[PDB]
Amino acid sequence: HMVLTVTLNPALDREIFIEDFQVNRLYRINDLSKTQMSPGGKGINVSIALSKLGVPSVATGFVGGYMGKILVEELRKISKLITTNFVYVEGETRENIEIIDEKNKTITAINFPGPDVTDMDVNHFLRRYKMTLSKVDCVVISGSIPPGVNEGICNELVRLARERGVFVFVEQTPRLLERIYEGPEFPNVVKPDLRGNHASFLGVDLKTFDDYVKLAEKLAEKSQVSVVSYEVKNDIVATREGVWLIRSKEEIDTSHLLGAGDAYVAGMVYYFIKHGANFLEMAKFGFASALAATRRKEKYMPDLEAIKKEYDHFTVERVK
Amino acid sequence: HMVLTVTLNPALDREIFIEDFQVNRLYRINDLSKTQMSPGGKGINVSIALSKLGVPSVATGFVGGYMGKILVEELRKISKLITTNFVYVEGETRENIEIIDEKNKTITAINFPGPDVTDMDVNHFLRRYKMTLSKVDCVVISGSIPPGVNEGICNELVRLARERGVFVFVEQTPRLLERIYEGPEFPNVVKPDLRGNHASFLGVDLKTFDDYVKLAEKLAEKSQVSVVSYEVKNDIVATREGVWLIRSKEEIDTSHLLGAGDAYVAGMVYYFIKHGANFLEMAKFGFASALAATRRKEKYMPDLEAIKKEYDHFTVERVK
Numbered sequence A, B: 001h002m003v004l005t006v007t008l009n010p011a012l013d014r015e016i017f018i019e020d021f022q023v024n025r026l027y028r029i030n031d032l033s034k035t036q037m038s039p040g041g042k043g044i045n046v047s048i049a050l051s052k053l054g055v056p057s058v059a060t061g062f063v064g065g066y067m068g069k070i071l072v073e074e075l076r077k078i079s080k081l082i083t084t085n086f087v088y089v090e091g092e093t094r095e096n097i098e099i100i101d102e103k104n105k106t107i108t109a110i111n112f113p114g115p116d117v118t119d120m121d122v123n124h125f126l127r128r129y130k131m132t133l134s135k136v137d138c139v140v141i142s143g144s145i146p147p148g149v150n151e152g153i154c155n156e157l158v159r160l161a162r163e164r165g166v167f168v169f170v171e172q173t174p175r176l177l178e179r180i181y182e183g184p185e186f187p188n189v190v191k192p193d194l195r196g197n198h199a200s201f202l203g204v205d206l207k208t209f210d211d212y213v214k215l216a217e218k219l220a221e222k223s224q225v226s227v228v229s230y231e232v233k234n235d236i237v238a239t240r241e242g243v244w245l246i247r248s249k250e251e252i253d254t255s256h257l258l259g260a261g262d263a264y265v266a267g268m269v270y271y272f273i274k275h276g277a278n279f280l281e282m283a284k285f286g287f288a289s290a291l292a293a294t295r296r297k298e299k300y301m302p303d304l305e306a307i308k309k310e311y312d313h314f315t316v317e318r319v320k
């Protein structure tokens, strides 16, 4: 059983933990927190998450320069369950800085652009993407898209994947999803990234609960399952059969959220592989996994133990 | 003439320029000109500074890991005038982060501690330090110590230099300078780093102009010249002939301050090398460079043209 992840714009994450972080002060970090940098980007975090649950993946995307070397060398060190298969480009993989304040519950994030990618790079990627598709049972396409690349590319990735009988998971922003839902093929599972969204989506402006439901329903028309976030700690789940709402029983630590959403997707993938296409339970195991991730301030991908213990910390209501 | 700079705790400085920087928000730096990355650490910046003025130096200290490699290579690209002679350690050279908000005049700075250095590493360093001293006419020892290094090392470094008739400049925090002013030999030129200081220093609690003057005088008992900062944009210069006060004629931009103090020291080193040991004029030229360094938001080590331009913008008063 094998998974392919696509991370077209990966990052080296630099997580810095400062309580009571404020503008205009010098902070001396304590002698034991060393200058460190971890592999990141959504698909790559999904790979890490899957490796923690014992599930192998091929991780692909674009990587470049010296930062690139670091990402690749570090990613390989995490587990032999992850085989790296990136397309190498000129220019550096982006560093991203996340300043996490566990006392005041804030994340201050600074994101850098990513490399300028070209048509030959995208060509090579498409060749290799097609090769790997033959070896895998499902694909996770998620995250941002680097400068240079046509925004229609994920449509081609979804299209190639579905035409080949490969089950597709997609987590992207509305602007990018609008582009996937044009094309003739569609994700099996879609989880929109609504972080900091103020934009309309599929001709739905998202103010009331009925709007979010109606958005989940629109996606459930062409995809088999939509998981749509609502008031930070809840997810609306829509399939052909009906609509559910998964709710955390407690408030979540908003500063602990880095990569929780990627633990969500990894869970859904894990469930799919181990137990098949029972969509609601997939969504649930993903939610349990996202919650476990929020129990630590770091970008933390939970293990099976940690995920299972979250099963008593949420409820599921049937909406329709 | 040829200078040795010692930077036991080098850094890569990542400068990020964000107008209206506030906490708990995501920033996307699209413009590649709103970030800057460069070799840093006080002695390394002095080497860069001296290079702009045509004075060569050997730069020594500890470097390590991925960040270490970047530092050395970047440093070598800055000028043929800088020779590196660093002991390579296991562990990462620190990357510090400075966020500069030019609109609201703010620097939010995050300083990482640096790698653990072992006792074998420190010995290899001392052994190379001794060798370089016969090749040089003066030495600059500035900035912090990395973890695992005894705070007495700075005393040994001054002592070794001084026994061999090498002229010594030091810029370090009180705690480290206390350790230097123990030992049998003393710096020729001392410029204490008082940033963020709350402790008493040589028996003086720094709360009034007279305290800062008493401190300059105590240091001037054992060193030929002391340069002590007062209210951000002034410096008390004490020699055996008396005490002066150099003041900026105008308010400086406190957000443009990164690395200004190393420009100060570099100017003094240059003046010493070129026009001899006239101390007040050394401090004045140092002050000019410091001012020049502040004229840009980026870490900028000035050239001679930019330094001379500042002779207009400060006064000297005689205190005693």
Ligand SMILES: [Mg+2]
Pocket: A256, A257, A258, A260, A293, A294, A295, A296, A297, A298, A299, A300
């Ligand atoms: Mg977490």
Ligand SMILES: [Mg+2]
Pocket: B256, B257, B258, B293, B294, B295, B296, B297, B298, B299, B300
């Ligand atoms: Mg500056």
